[model samples]
Target: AECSVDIQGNDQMQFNTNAITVDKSCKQFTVNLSHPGNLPKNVMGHNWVLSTAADMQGVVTDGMASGLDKDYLKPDDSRVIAHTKLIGSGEKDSITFDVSKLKEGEQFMFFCTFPGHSALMKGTLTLK
Candidate 1:
């Protein structure tokens, strides 16, 4: 689809881009995540999770309790709009979601829920 993007996660626990824009004309949007660092998954894994800006904190909170085995996400978490599996260095993951899930004028956030990673690895997403 035309609404596809690449996202990078590095050893610094940072995303290459902090903001993303999705073209509303596309029926779905896809995010491709890649980690170019040389660290192990358990040590510096990252994932891309999407949700309303307001729900970010709570999802991250519960995700902490969910543990890494669950990819730091709660099972059947309704708050998540879309997400990719936790990945390690040299690994890649991708996720796609319907564009209809997004609403105009609403704040959406994307972040990694690797325990404390969310503190700095978060960004905003909006419809274009």
Candidate 2:
């Protein structure tokens, strides 16, 4: 079973890749995100948030009130399948969640919720 993955986030509000595939044999999946840029958290922060493609807009919209302390994520957001903490230059965070949380036929998405970042910061996931 696949166990973990490593990804990079930069000052450009970018995630290095756009797609991820999960192996069904995995009991849990881990995502490790690192910020390698030189900007501060308030100016050019980044994060990784996952939810269904259908819930992307809602999650991003609702998370607006949660602020940076909550990683720009709505508190107890049920739509979030996985996520990483808000980070700035040289910071890092990781999250591990059950792969079974995904259901067949459901489309999942990963994105950065930092202000104005989603325009180019997003990714997709599919479980097999």
Can you give the TM-score per candidate against the true fold? 0.97, 0.94
Candidate 2 regions with alpha-carbon error over 4 angstroms: none
lDDT of 2 by residue, 1-128 (tens): 76788988897778999998888788898999999999999888888888999899888987866788887888989988888888899999989999789876679999888878877989898887
Q: Which predicted model would earn the best lDDT?
A: 1
Clash pairs, candidate 2, are none
RMSD of each: 1.0, 1.1
The global C-alpha lDDT for each of the candidates, from Candidate 1 onward, is: 0.93, 0.87
Candidate 1, which ten residues in sequence have the lowest lDDT sum? 1-10
Clashes counted in candidate 2 amount to: 0
